[PDB]
Amino acid sequence: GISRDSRHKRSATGAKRAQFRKKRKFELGRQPANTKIGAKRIHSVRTRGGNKKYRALRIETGNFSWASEGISKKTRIAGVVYHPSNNELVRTNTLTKAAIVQIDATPFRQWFEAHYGQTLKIESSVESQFSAGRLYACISSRPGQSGRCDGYILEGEELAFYLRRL
Amino acid sequence: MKLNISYPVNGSQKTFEIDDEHRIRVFFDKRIGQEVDGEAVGDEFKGYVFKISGGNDKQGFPMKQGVLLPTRIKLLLTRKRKSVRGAIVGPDLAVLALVIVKKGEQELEGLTDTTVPKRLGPKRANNIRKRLQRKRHQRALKVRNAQAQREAAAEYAQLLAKRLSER
Amino acid sequence: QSERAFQKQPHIRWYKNAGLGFKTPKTAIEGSYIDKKCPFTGLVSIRGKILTGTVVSTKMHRTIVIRRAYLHYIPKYNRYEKRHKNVPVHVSPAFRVQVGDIVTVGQCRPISKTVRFNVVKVS
Amino acid sequence: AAPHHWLLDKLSGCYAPRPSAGPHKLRESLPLIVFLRNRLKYALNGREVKAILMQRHVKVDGKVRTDTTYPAGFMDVITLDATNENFRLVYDVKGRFAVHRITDEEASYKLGKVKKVQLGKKGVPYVVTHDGRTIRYPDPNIKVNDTVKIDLASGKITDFIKFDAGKLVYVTGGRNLGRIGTIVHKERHDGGFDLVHIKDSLDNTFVTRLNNVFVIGEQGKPYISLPKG
Amino acid sequence: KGRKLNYSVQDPIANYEAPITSGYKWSDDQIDEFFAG
Amino acid sequence: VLKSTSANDVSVYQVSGTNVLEYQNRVELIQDFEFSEASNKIKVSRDGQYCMATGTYKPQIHVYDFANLSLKFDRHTDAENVDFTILSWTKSVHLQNDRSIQFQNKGGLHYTTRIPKFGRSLVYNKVNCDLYVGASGNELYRLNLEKGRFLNPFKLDTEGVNHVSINEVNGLLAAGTETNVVEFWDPRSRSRVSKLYLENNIDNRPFQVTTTSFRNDGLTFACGTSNGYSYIYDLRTSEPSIIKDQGYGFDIKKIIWLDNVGTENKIVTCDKRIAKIWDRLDGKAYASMEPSVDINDIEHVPGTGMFFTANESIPMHTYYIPSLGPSPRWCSFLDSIT
RNA sequence: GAUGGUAGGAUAGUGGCCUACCAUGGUUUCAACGGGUAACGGGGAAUAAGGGUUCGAUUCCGGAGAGGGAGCCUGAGAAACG
RNA sequence: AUACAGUGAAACUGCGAAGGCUCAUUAAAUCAGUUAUCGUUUAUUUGAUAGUUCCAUGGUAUAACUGUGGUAA
């Protein structure tokens, strides 16, 4: 990154003759670490005293949350199909916040068969993924700042809310 | 060339100015760690084996163990550009360091037949082999700290309970 | 009321109150509008000072451009040249503000490059 | 290089003593060197005021706090052991620090304006003041700008003065800094020039802010003693 | 489409490199009789 | 003596592996060869030294002098890179993951320009000096280094292109698209000449061609896919091909020839985990180079038998083959240690 | 990026601060935007002096620089006079 | 004072220097006050603030130091 200041750009009035200043330390834009899938490597960068910041690049073990009961359990990552904060970001298959990524939902199968007995009330277009294995789930946590991959599962309303999109 | 030689377990080390470089040519194009014989560096020390351990060349520049390229190169060490000779030994070493790991056929009145002792015995208890009143006071101050703080906290939480009952 | 991706929703339908003499309309308490930066449900909290004036343009959405003429006691040429000010402001689910419409706003948490004020009243 | 509040004579020096960090701010306090040395004159220079600070005569707020630039702000009761000196220092009517002399039963406490009440962590009600005494558990009816009375042996609130219409208020801040009389008017606006207004000898009127004013008692009965002329 | 495809002329790259005369070691007739089909 | 992996009656060696008495018999070739936990892309310059390796987090440039066996510098560039080339020595051009293009010099960062859409590949033309940059969509752009203009961008098919390359001895512009068509343009005419279609016999899903290459005879063309299937092509009966399924087959990214050293008609293929090498006119594997981690891409040093990968680990692996050729003049005691 | 909206990146965090997508906005005769110096002078920036009436106390002219641009590192604080 | 015991060159340590010249001309954007940050960082100052235990004390590896040396340095 470069900057965080209004001095390089124009305001709501249209001004000119900028030529302002050598940029300070507190306009610090670090490089955009597009977090991907790999082996888990988090860079421990420093800022503002001992404010360590976890910059995750190759995180896997996503803690994704069963919605209707709120069961955040551990799984892997496959790939993001739709994220128009950059439509090339899904072409390159990175992993950022608020992305809709696919999960092999085998521990969710284990929890359902463990606290319900039988195997398969829950919606049908996610029951198809209960059968097959890959369910859609959206990342909540920030791997570029907190270094973690947490998320929430897609269950019904939010599922169709994304499936009608793409 | 000069050959520094070290017999480590006896604690002996001495340099020997060996001219007549076809004696020297046994070491040529052999990098650090690879062993050698006494047979092609000398005749009076046969059955000898020396693990080489670097050496400053003329212009004094050291070699660090195992890079490549027996000329001089400019690396980054403890980070700034320092000049360092390559690990492989060639014709232009001033001194070359050697560790003798087996005595062969002749006694040496510098290395074998003369030796130095060590420095001094150990100081730590476990190094000599191979408090409890503080343990009283630590535990007593810890249980007293618990019996002060964890009781006083509830002792003003009950005053909060009195304010909540009166409110 | 969902024309964009990424789970358009309140962020924890939801309802709160900034207090301090400004009402929350019943659709803004329990209605289908999201209230992302409208301070009644919102994510922002109120502070600062509250300014009042009529408008000039409400052309783009979530842009309320207030005008604010005010008295100032000029001592230089001993006559009052009349004031005029401008401030962009995000929408609220209480009034489609047209030309005229003296309204007031409270200072909070810079939303765009130049907006710190969001509508809390219409009269 | 000085402020106005210290009552500092100009024929003193060149470098003015910056107070160190502490309870109060820089702009609303006087350190101990400008207190003892050149106001009531128990010293002649910095060397001997450091000497008596090492001797530890000062007992501000019941603790010793041996420091030269310790920022004694509003009504920190400076206590000196020899000749039982008890000093409550308040504001006069023209902006300076009038240091009134009090007695032991009055210096056994102080009062403090409450700034905010918090549900901070683990269900604990919470109160701060201008010296930052985070004391546990007041009643739920502590609004902003009320007045707690600190214990000064332990830290507990002993008495409480509610801020409402008809209370004796002290103004520290803005162009009303250091006035007493608290009743002509009440006017709470919604973000500025909001206050209770203060009388004069002819009962004149005045405007200030909420945070720049704080209560000291009742209409005729403050349990603080005040100096006179 | 503001910063998207500015068809301007830029200062440092106007003589960043220099061309070559013969270039391809083949002939253009070799191109034509190379991919006639 | 460095250990060798098992293969088909042939030996390879790695230097700077994940595993590479050992501390006191270290075999380190290039000092400070390690990045910040991954690697983007490595390539060796046309002259006998100065290899360049792009960065991973706070991405750098990392020029290594081969005649000094260490690092020269690391210009921390502004954004994360995907593709670049080297233009002789000191000049080089890069493009990042955003649609911006950097021009590094001896002083570094001579300019930063942009392309209107997100780009994926860049090549330079030695003849009349226009870099062709392949991006997403209908758009294959030019930035000519003569007069710094822009040129009349090449109209593609729908989705775009994964790789562009021009032929060396005659200039035939390749562009590996998504819909199996290879879209050969002519660097003379600025028009299409052919729209060759790629076929198979398995047809799992509609693969996209990701790697294009030529060599210095100017008659054949090496083609890739998004499935782990190498392809050869000639003008001689250009509709079929010879194909090479690979035993894992995710996405082949680097297919490069051996057209300048001995042991001829041999080619290196490289997908995400493995990089193999086989012979022309039969399609039988000469060797393979299985590392302990995935591969971001590779490169092969000219004149000799050594390879440099960019991977997803902390160091980069170098792979020496003492049967393909010798070790070069700056590594001229690798044949003495192993 | 002009003006705003949605999301992400980076942040110490607010923020078109940067990028994807979308809308064609926004300031102005109630002075936009632009023109220069006794802008080595001015603006209280401050002390005022018991008769000097724009001399007469000071903070700051603007930002930079440690041979020249570039990149990196340290720290509660830095794009370090070391 | 036969495991330490005072002077103390040279070495580790705690800190020191804790704020100094020249050059091209910015019109409330340089500056001064003020509102706010439940929109944020914070060493030091000050007030507060910790409850998971199956069949008498834990490991080599480096200095300083000796010893052999290289180099004009």
CSV table of N, CA, C and O (backbone and C1' of nucleotides) in Angstrom, one decimal, chain B residues 2-17 50-51 53 95-101 108-119, chain H residues 63 65-69:
chain,number,residue,atom,x,y,z
B,2,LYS,N,51.4,-22.5,5.7
B,2,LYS,CA,51.5,-22.9,7.1
B,2,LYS,C,50.3,-23.8,7.5
B,2,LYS,O,49.2,-23.5,7.1
B,3,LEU,N,50.6,-24.8,8.2
B,3,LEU,CA,49.6,-25.8,8.6
B,3,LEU,C,49.4,-25.7,10.2
B,3,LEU,O,50.3,-26.0,10.9
B,4,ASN,N,48.2,-25.1,10.6
B,4,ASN,CA,47.9,-25.2,12.0
B,4,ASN,C,47.2,-26.6,12.2
B,4,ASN,O,46.4,-27.0,11.4
B,5,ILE,N,47.7,-27.3,13.2
B,5,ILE,CA,47.2,-28.6,13.6
B,5,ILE,C,46.8,-28.6,15.0
B,5,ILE,O,47.5,-28.0,15.9
B,6,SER,N,45.7,-29.3,15.3
B,6,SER,CA,45.1,-29.3,16.7
B,6,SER,C,44.7,-30.7,17.1
B,6,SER,O,43.9,-31.3,16.4
B,7,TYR,N,45.4,-31.2,18.1
B,7,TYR,CA,44.9,-32.5,18.8
B,7,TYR,C,44.0,-32.1,19.9
B,7,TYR,O,44.5,-31.6,21.0
B,8,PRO,N,42.7,-32.2,19.8
B,8,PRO,CA,41.8,-31.5,20.7
B,8,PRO,C,41.7,-32.1,22.1
B,8,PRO,O,41.5,-31.4,23.1
B,9,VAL,N,41.7,-33.5,22.2
B,9,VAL,CA,41.4,-34.1,23.5
B,9,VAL,C,42.6,-34.0,24.4
B,9,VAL,O,42.4,-33.7,25.6
B,10,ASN,N,43.8,-34.0,23.9
B,10,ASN,CA,45.0,-33.7,24.7
B,10,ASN,C,45.1,-32.2,25.0
B,10,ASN,O,45.7,-31.7,25.9
B,11,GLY,N,44.5,-31.4,24.1
B,11,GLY,CA,44.7,-29.9,24.2
B,11,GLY,C,46.1,-29.6,23.7
B,11,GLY,O,46.9,-29.1,24.5
B,12,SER,N,46.3,-29.7,22.4
B,12,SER,CA,47.6,-29.3,21.8
B,12,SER,C,47.3,-28.7,20.4
B,12,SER,O,46.4,-29.2,19.7
B,13,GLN,N,48.1,-27.7,20.1
B,13,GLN,CA,48.0,-27.1,18.8
B,13,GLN,C,49.3,-26.4,18.4
B,13,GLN,O,49.9,-25.7,19.3
B,14,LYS,N,49.7,-26.6,17.2
B,14,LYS,CA,50.9,-26.0,16.7
B,14,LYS,C,50.9,-25.8,15.2
B,14,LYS,O,50.2,-26.5,14.5
B,15,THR,N,51.6,-24.7,14.7
B,15,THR,CA,51.7,-24.5,13.3
B,15,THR,C,53.0,-25.0,12.8
B,15,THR,O,54.0,-25.1,13.5
B,16,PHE,N,53.0,-25.4,11.5
B,16,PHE,CA,54.2,-25.9,10.8
B,16,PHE,C,54.3,-25.3,9.4
B,16,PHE,O,53.4,-25.5,8.6
B,17,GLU,N,55.4,-24.6,9.2
B,17,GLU,CA,55.6,-24.0,7.9
B,17,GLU,C,56.1,-25.0,6.9
B,17,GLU,O,57.3,-25.3,6.8
B,50,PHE,N,43.4,-35.7,9.2
B,50,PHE,CA,43.1,-34.3,9.6
B,50,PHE,C,41.8,-33.9,9.0
B,50,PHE,O,41.7,-33.8,7.8
B,51,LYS,N,40.8,-33.5,9.8
B,51,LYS,CA,39.6,-32.8,9.4
B,51,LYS,C,40.0,-31.3,9.3
B,51,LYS,O,40.4,-30.8,10.3
B,53,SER,N,39.5,-27.3,9.1
B,53,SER,CA,38.6,-26.5,9.8
B,53,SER,C,38.8,-25.0,9.4
B,53,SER,O,38.9,-24.1,10.2
B,95,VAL,N,47.6,-19.7,6.0
B,95,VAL,CA,47.5,-20.7,7.0
B,95,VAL,C,46.3,-21.6,6.7
B,95,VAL,O,45.3,-21.1,6.0
B,96,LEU,N,46.3,-22.8,7.1
B,96,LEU,CA,45.2,-23.8,6.9
B,96,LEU,C,45.1,-24.6,8.2
B,96,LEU,O,46.1,-25.1,8.7
B,97,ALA,N,43.9,-24.6,8.7
B,97,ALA,CA,43.6,-25.2,10.1
B,97,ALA,C,43.2,-26.7,9.9
B,97,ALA,O,42.4,-27.0,9.1
B,98,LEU,N,43.7,-27.5,10.8
B,98,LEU,CA,43.6,-28.9,10.8
B,98,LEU,C,43.3,-29.5,12.2
B,98,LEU,O,43.9,-29.0,13.1
B,99,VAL,N,42.5,-30.5,12.2
B,99,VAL,CA,42.3,-31.2,13.5
B,99,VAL,C,42.7,-32.7,13.3
B,99,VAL,O,42.1,-33.4,12.4
B,100,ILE,N,43.7,-33.1,14.1
B,100,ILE,CA,44.1,-34.5,14.0
B,100,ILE,C,43.3,-35.4,14.9
B,100,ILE,O,43.2,-35.2,16.1
B,101,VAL,N,42.6,-36.3,14.3
B,101,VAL,CA,41.6,-37.2,14.9
B,101,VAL,C,42.1,-38.6,15.1
B,101,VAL,O,41.4,-39.5,15.6
B,108,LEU,N,55.0,-36.8,18.1
B,108,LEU,CA,55.3,-35.4,17.9
B,108,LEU,C,55.7,-34.7,19.2
B,108,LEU,O,54.8,-34.6,20.1
B,109,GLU,N,56.9,-34.2,19.3
B,109,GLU,CA,57.2,-33.5,20.5
B,109,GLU,C,56.6,-32.1,20.6
B,109,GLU,O,57.0,-31.3,21.6
B,110,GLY,N,55.7,-31.7,19.7
B,110,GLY,CA,54.9,-30.6,19.9
B,110,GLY,C,53.4,-31.0,20.3
B,110,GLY,O,52.8,-30.4,21.2
B,111,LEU,N,52.9,-31.9,19.5
B,111,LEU,CA,51.4,-32.2,19.6
B,111,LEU,C,51.2,-33.4,20.6
B,111,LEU,O,50.4,-33.2,21.6
B,112,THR,N,51.7,-34.6,20.3
B,112,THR,CA,51.4,-35.7,21.1
B,112,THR,C,52.1,-35.7,22.5
B,112,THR,O,51.5,-35.7,23.5
B,113,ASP,N,53.5,-35.6,22.5
B,113,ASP,CA,54.3,-35.7,23.6
B,113,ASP,C,54.2,-34.5,24.6
B,113,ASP,O,54.8,-34.6,25.7
B,114,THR,N,53.6,-33.4,24.2
B,114,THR,CA,53.4,-32.3,25.1
B,114,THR,C,51.9,-31.9,25.1
B,114,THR,O,51.3,-31.9,24.0
B,115,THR,N,51.4,-31.6,26.2
B,115,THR,CA,49.9,-31.3,26.4
B,115,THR,C,49.7,-30.3,27.5
B,115,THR,O,50.5,-30.1,28.4
B,116,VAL,N,48.5,-29.6,27.4
B,116,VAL,CA,48.1,-28.7,28.5
B,116,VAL,C,46.9,-29.3,29.2
B,116,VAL,O,46.2,-30.1,28.6
B,117,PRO,N,46.7,-28.9,30.5
B,117,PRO,CA,45.4,-29.3,31.1
B,117,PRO,C,44.3,-28.4,30.8
B,117,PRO,O,44.4,-27.5,30.0
B,118,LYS,N,43.2,-28.6,31.5
B,118,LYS,CA,42.0,-27.8,31.4
B,118,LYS,C,42.1,-26.5,32.2
B,118,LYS,O,43.1,-26.2,32.7
B,119,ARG,N,40.9,-25.9,32.4
B,119,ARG,CA,40.9,-24.6,33.1
B,119,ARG,C,40.6,-24.7,34.6
B,119,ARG,O,41.5,-24.4,35.4
H,63,A,P,33.2,-19.9,23.1
H,63,A,O5',33.1,-18.6,24.0
H,63,A,C5',32.9,-17.3,23.4
H,63,A,C4',32.2,-16.3,24.3
H,63,A,C3',33.2,-15.4,25.0
H,63,A,O3',33.7,-14.4,24.2
H,63,A,C1',31.4,-16.1,26.5
H,65,C,P,39.2,-11.6,27.9
H,65,C,O5',39.4,-13.0,28.6
H,65,C,C5',39.9,-13.1,29.9
H,65,C,C4',40.4,-14.5,30.2
H,65,C,C3',41.5,-15.1,29.3
H,65,C,O3',42.8,-14.6,29.7
H,65,C,C1',39.8,-16.7,29.6
H,66,U,P,44.0,-14.5,28.6
H,66,U,O5',44.4,-16.0,28.3
H,66,U,C5',45.1,-16.8,29.3
H,66,U,C4',45.1,-18.2,29.0
H,66,U,C3',46.0,-18.6,27.8
H,66,U,O3',47.4,-18.7,28.2
H,66,U,C1',43.9,-19.7,27.7
H,67,G,P,48.5,-18.3,27.2
H,67,G,O5',48.3,-19.3,25.9
H,67,G,C5',48.8,-20.6,26.0
H,67,G,C4',48.3,-21.4,24.8
H,67,G,C3',48.7,-20.9,23.5
H,67,G,O3',50.0,-21.3,23.1
H,67,G,C1',46.4,-21.4,23.4
H,68,U,P,50.9,-20.4,22.1
H,68,U,O5',50.4,-20.8,20.7
H,68,U,C5',50.5,-22.2,20.2
H,68,U,C4',49.8,-22.4,18.9
H,68,U,C3',50.2,-21.3,17.8
H,68,U,O3',51.4,-21.5,17.3
H,68,U,C1',47.9,-21.7,17.8
H,69,G,P,52.3,-20.2,16.9
H,69,G,O5',51.7,-19.7,15.5
H,69,G,C5',50.9,-18.6,15.4
H,69,G,C4',49.9,-18.7,14.2
H,69,G,C3',49.8,-17.4,13.4
H,69,G,O3',50.8,-17.3,12.4
H,69,G,C1',47.7,-18.3,13.9
